[PDB]
Every structure is written in structure tokens, then in C-alpha cells.
């Protein structure tokens with residue numbers, strides 16, 4: 001609040017304007033970064049209420065209805081594990097909307113495959129989507145269909161191991 | 171207002187139904203990327219002192 | 221990476237201090253519902269599409285390419301046989317046409 005200090009600071013010109021403009025550019029760049037990363041879909045997709053995906057379990061990555069934050073258990077664990085003229089501007093996208101964007105992406109990639117990323121969301125059963133992905137890496141569909149239960153069990157075990165590894169490693 | 175993220179779409183998922191496209195659109199989109207700037211050179215002695 | 225949709229091709233255009241890419245892409249349109257199955261059960265054998273997908277309009281079963289609706293008769297030329305019908309979950313019963321079958325009959 002010293003007026004003499006500001007009077008002496010006026011001799012240096014527009015340094016303060018340059019610093020404010022650089023910080024403003026950084027601040028809008030952060031919102032642009034979040035917009036480019038998470039807002040890649042303009043349709044907010046939802047999963048069906050019945051979670052019949054041919055034995056595949058997505059409860060650890062789908063949003064939990066019991067939680068007020070509407071986050072997944074993995075996302076809840078991730079948020080728990082991260083801990084004078086100065087102002088902190090809030091981000092343009094709140095954590096709830098970023099969680100909603102990730103939920104929309106998860107619903108799109110579970111219910112519609114990769115079709116929603118290239119156009120309208122075309123529904124497909126998940127054991128058929130997995131077979132298409134198996135054909136993408138050069139494995140025949142029959143291998144996926146015959147061993148669908150084993151692959152579903154391995155996928156669920158791997159997701160549980162991911163949650164355990166995140167919870168057990170600082 | 172509180173901004174809407176997108177239009178709400180509920181995918182009609184079931185374990186035995188698929189959606190197959192019957193038509194297509196040839197879509198052309200623009201992408202603008204900067205390549206270079208103006209090449210500026212400053213004579214340091216002339217700028218400071220003339 | 222090269223526009224929204226399935227990328228077909230691109231065109232470069234010069235711009236002042238920049239480049240403009242005209243991305244020509246393929247967007248699916250006018251989607252239609254069909255009843256689908258992973259495999260076709262015929263003669264105690266499981267049939268899987270070589271490159272397409274089994275679809276049904278309600279009464280009849282066909283095989284089509286994944287990105288465009290083009291129904292064709294389910295034959296041995298576009299399907300392959302692996303195993304019986306006891307393993308695949310959701311296999312349905314339908315006939316599989318044989319192109320060689322009218323030839324040896326005549």
C-alpha cells in the first residue's frame with residue numbers, strides 16, 4: 001500500500017503489464033490443455049443400468065453412485081493419494097465435470113467401441129468389441145469367443161491388481 | 171450459467187444388438203498450423219546507441 | 221490425427237506463415253439396428269465370419285462388412301469353422317449355405 005514505492009515503480013515502465021500478460025497466457029494455456037485432453041467428445045454417454053458385459057467387470061472404473069463426487073473407486077483413490085498479491089484462479093473445468101468427461105469416454109468405449117470417436121456412437125456387444133480388437137492385433141475371433149470366461153477373469157484380476165498396486169505404492 | 175458439457179445421449183446397449191451404418195458422409199475439415207515466424211534481426215549497438 | 225472420423229486422405233495448402241490441411245475423412249451415417257450373434261451353429265459346428273459380422277433383420281441371418289451394411293448369404297466362402305457349438309456363449313442356430321452343394325447334385 002506504499003504510494004512512494006508505486007511512484008518509484010512507475011519509473012520502470014510496463015514491466016508489471018508484461019508479467020501479468022505472461023501469467024494470463026499461462027493461465028489460459030492450462031484451461032486449453034484440459035480442454036484438449038478431456039473434452040474430445042460432444043456427446044455425454046451413459047452406461048446401461050444393467051451391467052451385463054459378458055463377464056467383464058468395470059465397477060472399479062465406472063462412477064460410483066454411492067459417492068457424492070460421482071467418481072470411480074480408482075479415481076477416488078487417485079484423488080485421495082494426491083496432496084501478498086497472490087491469487088489462484090480456479091480451473092474452468094471442475095473435478096466433477098472432468099469426472100463426467102471421463103465417464104462419457106468410458107461409456108462410449110464400452111458400449112460403442114471406437115465408433116463414437118469417428119462419428120455417431122454405434123452400439124456393439126462388448127464380447128464382439130473385444131473380438132474386433134483381437135482381430136486388430138492379428139488373433140482370430142474364435143480364440144476370443146472360446147476363452148471369453150478366462151479373458152474376463154484375467155481382466156477383472158488385472159483391474160483389481162491395478163487398484164491394489166496404486167493403493168500399496170506411495 | 172453452469173456450462174453443459176454436451177448433449178446427453180444414452181447408447182442403446184444390449185448383449186445381442188448391433189448398429190450398422192447404411193450410409194456415409196465424405197467430410198472435409200480444416201486444420202491450421204503455424205510453421206514459421208517473421209525473421210527479425212536487431213542491431214544491438216544501433217538499437218541501444220544509434 | 222488427420223481429422224475427425226476415419227481418415228481417407230489430406231490436401232496441403234500454403235498460408236501466410238502457416239499450413240492448412242484439408243482432411244478428407246469418412247463418417248458413417250444412417251445407422252440401423254440389427255440383432256447380432258457371435259457365431260452360427262450348423263451341423264454341430266461353430267461358424268465365425270472371416271472379415272464381417274453376422275446380422276439379423278428379424279427373420280433372416282446375413283453376414284456384412286463391419287463399416288457398411290451389405291447383407292450377404294452366410295456361406296462357407298466368407299465363414300470359417302472352429303469347434304462345436306457347446307463352447308461359444310450366445311451362438312444361434314442357422315443354416316450355412318454351401319456353394320459346392322448344387323454342383324455335385326447336378
Ligand SMILES: *[C@@H]1O[C@H](CO)[C@@H](O[C@@H]2O[C@H](CO)[C@@H](O)[C@H](O)[C@H]2NC(C)=O)[C@H](O)[C@H]1NC(C)=O
Pocket residue numbers: 051057058059
Ligand atoms: C464386479 O466387481 C465388484 C468389485 O469386486 C463386485 O462387488 C463385490 O461383490 C461381492 C459379492 O456381492 C461383495 O462381497 C463385495 O463386497 C463387492 N465389492 C465391492 C467393492 O463392491 C461385483 O460383484 C462384481 N460383479 C458385478 C456384476 O458387478
Ligand SMILES: *[C@@H]1O[C@H](CO)[C@@H](O[C@@H]2O[C@H](CO)[C@@H](O)[C@H](O)[C@H]2NC(C)=O)[C@H](O)[C@H]1NC(C)=O
Pocket residue numbers: 180181182251252253
Ligand atoms: C435401436 O433400438 C433402440 C431401442 O429399441 C432405440 O433406442 C431408443 O430410441 C428412441 C428414439 O431415439 C428413444 O426415445 C428411446 O429412449 C431409446 N431407447 C433406449 C433404451 O435408449 C434406438 O434408437 C434404435 N436405433 C436406431 C438407429 O433407431
Ligand SMILES: *[C@@H]1O[C@H](CO)[C@@H](O[C@@H]2O[C@H](CO)[C@@H](O)[C@H](O)[C@H]2NC(C)=O)[C@H](O)[C@H]1NC(C)=O
Pocket residue numbers: 192193194250
Ligand atoms: C445416402 O445419403 C445420400 C446423401 O447423404 C443420399 O443422397 C440423396 O438422395 C435423395 C433421394 O435419393 C436426393 O433427393 C438427395 O439430393 C441426395 N443427396 C445427395 C447429396 O446426393 C442417398 O440417397 C442415401 N442413400 C441411402 C441408401 O440412404
Ligand SMILES: *[C@@H]1O[C@H](CO)[C@@H](O[C@@H]2O[C@H](CO)[C@@H](O)[C@H](O)[C@H]2NC(C)=O)[C@H](O)[C@H]1NC(C)=O
Pocket residue numbers: 277278279280
Ligand atoms: C430380412 O431380409 C430378407 C432379405 O431381403 C427378407 O426376405 C425377403 O422378404 C421379401 C419381403 O417379405 C420377400 O419378397 C422375399 O422373398 C424374401 N426373401 C427370401 C430369400 O426369403 C426378410 O423378409 C427380411 N425380414 C424382415 C423381418 O424384415
Ligand SMILES: *[C@@H]1O[C@H](CO)[C@@H](O[C@@H]2O[C@H](CO)[C@@H](O)[C@H](O)[C@H]2NC(C)=O)[C@H](O)[C@H]1NC(C)=O
Pocket residue numbers: 261313
Ligand atoms: C440349436 O440346435 C441344437 C442341436 O440341434 C439344439 O440342441 C438340442 O436341443 C434339444 C431340445 O432340448 C435336445 O433334445 C437335444 O438333445 C439338443 N441336442 C444337442 C446336440 O445338444 C438346440 O436346442 C437348438 N437351439 C435353438 C435355440 O434352437
Ligand SMILES: *[C@@H]1O[C@H](CO)[C@@H](O)[C@H](O)[C@H]1NC(C)=O
Pocket residue numbers: 052054185186309310
Ligand atoms: C442376453 O441377455 C438376455 C437378457 O438380458 C439373456 O436372456 C441372454 O441369455 C443373454 N445372452 C448372452 C449370450 O449373454
